[PDB]
Write a protein that binds this ligand. Structure first.
Ligand SMILES: CC(=O)Nc1ccc(N(Cc2cccc(Cl)c2)C(=O)Cc2cncc3ccccc23)cn1
Ligand SMILES: CC(=O)Nc1ccc(N(Cc2cccc(Cl)c2)C(=O)Cc2cncc3ccccc23)cn1
Ligand SMILES: [Cl-]
Lengths: 298, 300
């Protein structure tokens, strides 16, 4: 029993964290094989022009107490790729994935190439992450683990004026309408990830919390009309299908849980809590709930 | 900026997780040097659950009764001993991934990261606090026994918990790495109930200082209070008493935010009296008590 925000074991990623120094700037790099990936801001910035002026010895890559010698440098979007003479002997089975809003991942927050903490995030519908990062965290990576394969999906680049965070996939493409320049940028109004709230309500039913369950069911259109009005993301047929296993396990049809959620939005908690929380949690996907309520290991 | 429940990077602990099998029972073990630590109830039968004599069950065991598996390699058990509720299985191979480590017994209110394992395989990492009633509100299924709680201070892993059991309310009970249970619990199927849980007041205050550091000020007020008056209000809400040690420990956050401890205490008094009024503090609609003063300073 119990439900916790749970991050993937960060070990496979910790063995990849290196420190990247370019002049006065020091941030984190992801060392996979003989390549170190880091935010290109480490170098109104014309990055292509700044990078051609750089030489290999300008970059100092430090992996623990060993300095790696940079033998090449190239830029892929907002990410810098520093070729090194040494392949990372701790390189796990990995792949680069671009996630969609609503999807969750573990963040390994690093400072000076040293892992300091691990936490579970969701890519907000406005393409920001509500992370916890201080200056020096740039280059910290977001990942998931599938069997024994690390899926790298995020690299930290910046903090927006509201305290939310913005970054890219491992191909340097930003999540959202953000740029890596010192310019006025604001995240769009955030919305609730409806499919993740429903997944979390199924987790509460699995943990014995049933007070919110009602006799009612709704049409998907009627639910979306109500949810849209409360700044909740629309629920698609894909979301209903993905919630199928939890619906089968708890005996609560997806549109049955939607009618419970419909009431929760129009009326509130009435002083009650679900899984120890007084707000509807949206940073647990349907797969996260299945994994935690079934004991899948990595 | 931002505030998250943050666990320690679990890598140094993952390299120690092994599977321990004794007959039909399979749980997790912590492999440090040439010793594997695990809950002693791995030696229990279906008959020896309500009132097992572990000393008597262990003397009947031989080294070949324990199967220790570290990845796809079986470790040879060359000795077995019991230290309180933990079993220590001596192996003929020192763990080459053994980090700098130490065994620490924590106090209620203290936080630690839990690496939940099944069959010696790490499945997830989360953050916990030792509740004032000596239970942990973990996330554990059957097979998680032997999962460990830890903190990391520069290169060194402080092991502070090993998971043993789930109480009838869904809360979890376990021991330090010397086998001494946290709380009035025993590793038997006997009727056991956790005491009524209370809020870790010092951690709530620490979390309110984190909210001020992050720009949240709506809950602040012009009032101060005496420590005794605060404790009288706090107990009525099932909050732990705040001691002078707690006030002293909150000193650095008080200095950093310019809000005296007794001033923040009057803010907590008001929050307990009115509630949130539809507002949130650090994205939460309830007062969080699983961030210590030390955690808040480290994260900020
Ligand atoms: C050398 C140095 O100070 N570098 C630095 C400083 C500041 C930043 N910026 C601003 C910035 C401005 C133009 C473009 C971009 Cl992409 C980024 C960041 O956002 C980094 C950052 C990340 N996460 C949490 C943070 C908390 C406090 C302060 C900074 C944080 C980057 N590099
Ligand atoms: C073979 C088998 O089922 N083993 C088993 C079953 C039950 C238990 N007990 C009870 C018990 C009983 C005698 C002594 C002690 Cl110390 C403990 C547990 O509490 C294990 C456990 C741990 N964490 C989360 C759990 C979630 C659901 C069910 C069990 C969980 C142990 N082994
Ligand atoms: Cl699923």
């Amino acid at each position: 029993s119990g439900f916790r925000k749970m991050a993937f074991p960060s070990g496979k990623v910790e063995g990849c964290m290196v420190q990247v120094t370019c002049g006065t700037t020091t941030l984190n790099g992801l060392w996979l094989d003989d390549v170190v990936y880091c935010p290109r801001h480490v170098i109104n910035p014309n990055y292509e022009d700044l990078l051609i002026r750089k030489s290999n010895h300008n970059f100092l890559v430090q992996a623990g107490n060993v300095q790696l010698r940079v033998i090449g440098h190239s830029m892929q979007n907002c990410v810098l790729k520093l070729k090194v003479d040494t392949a990372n002997p701790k390189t796990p089975k990995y792949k680069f994935v671009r996630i969609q809003p609503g999807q969750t991942f573990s963040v390994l927050a690093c400072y000076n190439g040293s892992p300091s903490g691990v936490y579970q995030c969701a890519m907000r519908p406005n393409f920001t992450i509500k992370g916890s990062f201080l200056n020096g965290s740039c280059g910290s990576v977001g990942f998931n683990i599938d069997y024994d394969c690390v899926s790298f999906c995020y690299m930290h680049h910046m903090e927006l004026p509201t305290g939310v965070h913005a970054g890219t996939d491992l191909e340097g493409n930003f999540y959202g309408p953000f740029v890596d320049r010192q310019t006025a940028q604001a995240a769009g109004t955030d919305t609730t990830i409806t499919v993740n709230v429903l997944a979390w309500l199924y987790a509460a039913v699995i943990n014995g919390d049933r007070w919110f369950l009602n006799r009612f069911t709704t049409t998907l259109n009627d639910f979306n009309l109500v949810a849209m009005k409360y700044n909740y993301e629309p629920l698609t047929q894909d979301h209903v299908d993905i919630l199928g296993p939890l619906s089968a396990q708890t005996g609560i049809a997806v549109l049955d849980m939607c009618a419970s959620l419909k009431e929760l939005l129009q009326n509130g908690m009435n002083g009650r809590t679900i899984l120890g929380s007084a707000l509807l949690e949206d940073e647990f996907t349907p797969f996260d709930v299945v994994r935690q309520c079934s004991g899948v290991t990595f």
